[PDB]
Swiss-Prot record, chain D:
<keyword id="KW-0689">Ribosomal protein</keyword>
<dbReference type="GO" id="GO:1990904">
    <property type="term" value="C:ribonucleoprotein complex"/>
</dbReference>
<comment type="function">
    <text>Required for the processing of the 20S rRNA-precursor to mature 18S rRNA in a late step of the maturation of 40S ribosomal subunits. Has a physiological role leading to 18S rRNA stability.</text>
</comment>
<dbReference type="InterPro" id="IPR038579">
    <property type="entry name" value="Ribosomal_eS21_sf"/>
</dbReference>
<dbReference type="InterPro" id="IPR018279">
    <property type="entry name" value="Ribosomal_eS21_CS"/>
</dbReference>
<dbReference type="GO" id="GO:0006412">
    <property type="term" value="P:translation"/>
</dbReference>
<dbReference type="GO" id="GO:0003735">
    <property type="term" value="F:structural constituent of ribosome"/>
</dbReference>
<keyword id="KW-0687">Ribonucleoprotein</keyword>
<dbReference type="Pfam" id="PF01249">
    <property type="entry name" value="Ribosomal_S21e"/>
</dbReference>
<keyword id="KW-0963">Cytoplasm</keyword>
<dbReference type="GO" id="GO:0005737">
    <property type="term" value="C:cytoplasm"/>
</dbReference>
<comment type="similarity">
    <text>Belongs to the eukaryotic ribosomal protein eS21 family.</text>
</comment>
<keyword id="KW-0698">rRNA processing</keyword>
<protein>
    <recommendedName>
        <fullName>Small ribosomal subunit protein eS21</fullName>
    </recommendedName>
</protein>
<dbReference type="InterPro" id="IPR001931">
    <property type="entry name" value="Ribosomal_eS21"/>
</dbReference>
<dbReference type="GO" id="GO:0006364">
    <property type="term" value="P:rRNA processing"/>
</dbReference>
<dbReference type="GO" id="GO:0005840">
    <property type="term" value="C:ribosome"/>
</dbReference>
Length: 129, 150, 208, 87, 185, 81
RNA sequence: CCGGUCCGCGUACUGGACCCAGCCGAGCCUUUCCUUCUGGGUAGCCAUUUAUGGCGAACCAGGACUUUUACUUUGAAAAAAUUAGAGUGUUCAAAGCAGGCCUUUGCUCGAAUAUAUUAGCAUGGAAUAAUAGAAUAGGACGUUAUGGUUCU
């Protein structure tokens, strides 16, 4: 069955971005997907996206601008200590100067740079660069 | 999809976006309830009452008019069947296959199908016990199944 | 945008339909779907010649941007288009490639007719596949006259027209030649009748 | 890319595809650079004055270059009602 | 003043109730204005010189108002010129419980903030029905709702909608845009 | 097609899609007011009816269920509600 | 923003930012409050009889209750030796925890600090993932609502 809606959403985004499409349709939606997309939009990796209410899980249409190399989930959402964040960014990110590891912390969903700023840690959720 | 097959069919109903009654609907939330109880006493299951309502009375959804689902209304008026309808039809089909099997002992296909139906009964009956629809000691017995549905 | 003088005039629209330019192939690929107006009940697809006209105007503007007129190469492997491309080269100063295209003309620099065009214009992507294929090796943009069944691979500017018509091929080439000269200023304005007749650029059988 | 003192230590800031924003590599020989002449109000092509677009070899290989130019030229006014956003 | 279900009604509430004891004069709509009551009349100023008038009604009393609301608004708009009249029900919003909060009764969904804002968004356009809602997430960070209305009974609201957007913004703080995709146009 | 308005599909192409494959799934069925030829009595009948609906006055079958839409009997005229 | 000085990009130091924006917080209001309980204690209410009528939140200190977790922050704890690591001319070094001062009837920096990690303890937060609740109501509030039956 459908075990991770975030993985389905990011896979659809990756396939549309790799094929040069400037828009992609995502089904189903969720809060985690929307907040993950907001982080990507905040750093400029995607453009405006639109939520469609169908009295169900929902749908999302994302506009792609060609700056996205790869976004992906980490399944399962491993527990990450603050001292372990450095090891994760080395394995997943192309360099030490750009790219973000997305975490779900009790302070909210945020990138690894923001997580160090507010000194919080949670479970790893995905990445984008 | 299709727990007990290789099928991947997607045919199903598609509820309209609107959750309100159509403007042309004139029956009250009561008249539907007495209609449901009238049909329930004729022996119809909740599926059949809903089929008759849209087919002959224009009741697109009982929920958008009355506010409650069909089984919820019967349970509120003491008209809920003891066995849930879908579990009843699985047991009735299993009864029919078992009755056919004792007269056709070489029908190995019916033996295979009987295992599927009965496996489907146990998964559903186990679920109904966790949600306290069936008693915790409720168990499906092949020997005494004919009593429950016949 | 564009002056209204560049709009499709009724005279040219009469020419396009009388030359059966609007008849597109029975089967249309997904990339040419926007150019189909409606399918005719026999099976033929009707080409939206309004879109055809604008691509012609767009295509002529790209040709005019090439400094050396000889650097534009016009190609035709079909026999129906060989006369059209030869006269286009004479009028515009372009380099015509009629008939067989020698493989290696763009990549093999020791061949006899080794050319380095800044732009390649093709009558049909299917029968001129070799000319189109080598252009994708040396960074040559391609303008192609495409039918509804013509492939769109490595084609930047597609002129939607009937590739399998004796008069369709000649008319489109004549229209490009007239517009290129109008932009160059050879034709004084967009209303002056051109001396050349679309009968010239038409293939003639050995009978005559 | 520049150092701490601000000097551009980068050689060869590369071009990007007009359709997909991909970087056009130095040996991508299927990539082209379309140059389209500007036309004055007299209907004449203006000499040495062009609208320019670049397409990566990937877009051209899929056959989407034609549909991308239809969209790109219509947004810049080079075309009217030939490309439709809604399909 | 018996029409008002609130202690110390304002002068505007009395004037509105004064209209309420005048529309039953014609017997076509009289058999139903005796039981009708309201709790408050919130009024805000919208652009263009108009003023939005919000009538707050007990939620159980909402379905009684819905039977005569189409007529009743038209004469109330006549009695009070340059006034846009809407009828809203005073739904209650229960805060989301904290993790350490002492256990209370399970909060019904009708009392949630999402449901109530969706509910007032439904009472705003009463004569028409919503056929679809979309939410844009702009690059700036702000979010804008879009509500699509049915063309049936559109003439009752087609000249307003702008009053609704500012009124919805006043009550919730979020931005919404109303569009009727299927007009004749 | 690399660029396309997914939020505003053409309503013509939107109608050719399967009923579950639209932006918002929507039934293509409807309800009808059926006039039998014998008498005049409004009877609301589902388009894809599974029941042999009979009008109240005379016990005459109005429609016969099929694989898809129900088939109205001769002399019966329908109007979509 | 005097970069004088400190000790020549220097530029550390730091009088002076006037803070652009940005970043880490904290409260208040939007239908959004530990139900409390006992004082302090009573100050302003409802001051018509007050800190002689009825503002316990007007902040503490002494009581009463509490859906269960998982997770993550911080803290105490996890012996010394070993490891990493600050200092120190064992003639260098491996080491060691020594040592240094004008030459001393004596003066005098030290012998740091990190890491431990599953389990247990205390703690901030409440995203994520579970869990319980109001359905034959045997449901919630009445702060001072009216009785009755028991029990301390
Ligand atoms: Mg940005
Ligand atoms: Mg590795
Ligand atoms: Mg980084
Ligand atoms: Mg990047
Ligand atoms: Mg499936
Ligand atoms: Mg299975
Ligand atoms: Mg189903
Ligand atoms: Mg009267
Ligand atoms: Zn009849």
């Amino acid at each position: 069955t459908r075990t991770s809606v975030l993985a389905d959403a990011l896979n659809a985004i990756n396939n549309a971005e790799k094929t040069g499409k400037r828009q992609v349709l995502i089904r189903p939606s969720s809060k985690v997907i929307i907040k993950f997309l907001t982080v990507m939009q905040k750093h400029g990796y995607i453009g405006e996206f639109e939520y469609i209410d169908d009295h169900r899980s929902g749908k999302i249409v994302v506009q792609l601008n060609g700056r996205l190399n790869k976004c992906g989930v980490i399944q399962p959402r491993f527990n990450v200590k603050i001292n372990d964040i450095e090891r994760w960014t080395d394995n997943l990110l192309p360099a030490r100067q750009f790219g973000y590891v997305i975490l779900t912390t009790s302070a909210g969903i945020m990138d690894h740079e923001e997580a160090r700023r507010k000194h919080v840690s949670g479970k790893i959720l995905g990445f984008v660069y | 999809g299709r727990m007990h097959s290789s099928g991947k069919g997607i045919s199903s109903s598609a509820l309209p976006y609107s959750r309100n009654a159509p403007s042309w609907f004139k029956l009250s939330s009561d008249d539907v309830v007495e209609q449901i109880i009238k049909y329930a006493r004729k022996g119809l299951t909740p599926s059949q009452i809903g089929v008759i309502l849209r087919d002959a009375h224009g009741v697109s959804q009982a929920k958008v008019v009355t506010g409650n689902k069909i089984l919820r209304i019967l349970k509120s008026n003491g008209l809920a069947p003891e066995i849930p309808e879908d579990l009843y039809y699985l047991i009735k089909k299993a009864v029919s296959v078992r009755k056919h099997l004792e007269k056709n002992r070489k029908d190995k296909d019916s033996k295979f199908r009987l295992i599927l139906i009965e496996s489907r009964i146990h998964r559903l009956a186990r679920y109904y016990r966790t949600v306290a629809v069936l008693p915790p000691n409720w168990k499906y017995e092949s020997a005494t199944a004919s009593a429950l549905v016949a | 945008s564009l002056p209204a003088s560049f709009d499709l005039t009724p005279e040219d629209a009469k020419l396009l339909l009388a030359a059966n330019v609007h008849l597109g192939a029975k089967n249309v690929q997904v990339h040419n779907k926007p150019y189909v107006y409606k399918t005719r009940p026999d099976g033929m697809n009707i080409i939206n010649i309004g879109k055809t006209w604008e691509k012609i105007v767009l295509a002529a503007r790209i040709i005019a941007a090439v400094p050396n007129a000889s650097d534009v190469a016009v190609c035709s492997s079909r026999t129906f288009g060989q006369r059209a491309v030869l006269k286009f080269a004479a009028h515009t100063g372009a380099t015509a490639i009629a008939g067989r295209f020698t493989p290696g003309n763009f990549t093999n620099y020791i061949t006899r007719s080794f050319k380095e065009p800044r732009l390649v214009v093709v009558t049909d992507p299917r029968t001129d596949a070799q000319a189109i294929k080598e252009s994708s090796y040396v960074n040559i943009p391609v303008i192609a006259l495409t039918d509804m069944d013509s492939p769109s691979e490595y084609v930047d500017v597609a002129i939607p027209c009937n590739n399998k018509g004796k008069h369709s091929i000649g008319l489109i080439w004549w229209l490009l030649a007239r517009e290129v000269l109008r932009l160059r200023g050879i034709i004084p304005d967009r209303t002056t009748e051109w001396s050349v007749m679309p009968d010239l650029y038409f293939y003639r059988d050995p009978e005559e | 890319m520049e150092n701490d003192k601000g000097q551009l230590v980068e050689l060869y800031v590369p071009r990007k595809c007009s359709a997909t924003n991909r970087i056009i590599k130095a040996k991508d020989h299927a990539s082209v650079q379309i140059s389209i002449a500007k036309v004055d109000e007299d209907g004449r092509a203006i000499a040495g004055e062009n609208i320019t677009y670049a397409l990566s070899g990937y877009v051209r290989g899929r056959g989407e270059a034609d549909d991308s130019l239809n969209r790109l030229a219509q947004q810049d006014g080079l075309l009217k009602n030939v490309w439709s956003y809604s399909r | 003043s018996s029409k008002i279900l609130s202690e110390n009604p304002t002068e505007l509430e009395l004037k509105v109730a004064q209209a309420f004891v005048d529309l039953e004069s014609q017997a076509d709509l009289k058999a139903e204005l005796r039981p009708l009551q309201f709790k408050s009349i919130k009024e805000i100023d919208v652009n263009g010189g108009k003023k939005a008038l919000a009538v707050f009604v007990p939620p159980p009393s909402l379905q009684a108002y819905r039977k005569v609301q189409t007529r009743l608004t038209r004469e109330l708009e006549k009695k009070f010129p340059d006034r846009h009249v809407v009828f809203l029900a005073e739904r209650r919003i229960l805060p989301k419980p904290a993790r350490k909060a002492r256990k209370q009764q399970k909060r019904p969904r009708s009392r949630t903030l999402t449901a109530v804002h969706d509910k007032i968004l439904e009472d705003l356009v009463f004569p028409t029905e919503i056929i679809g809602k979309r939410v844009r997430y702009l690059v700036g960070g702000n979010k804008i709702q879009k509500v699509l209305l049915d063309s049936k009974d559109s003439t009752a609201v087609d000249y307003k909608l702008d009053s609704f957007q500012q009124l919805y913004s006043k009550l919730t703080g979020k931005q919404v845009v109303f569009e009727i995709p299927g007009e004749s146009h | 097609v690399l660029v396309q308005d997914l939020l505003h599909p053409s309503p013509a192409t939107e109608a050719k899609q399967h009923k579950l494959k639209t932006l918002v799934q929507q039934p293509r069925s409807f309800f009808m007011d059926v006039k039998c030829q014998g008498c005049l009595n409004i009877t609301t009948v589902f388009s894809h009816a599974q029941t042999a609906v009979t009008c109240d006055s005379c016990s005459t079958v109005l429609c016969t269920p099929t694989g898809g839409k129900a088939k109205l009997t001769e002399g019966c005229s329908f109007r979509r509600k």
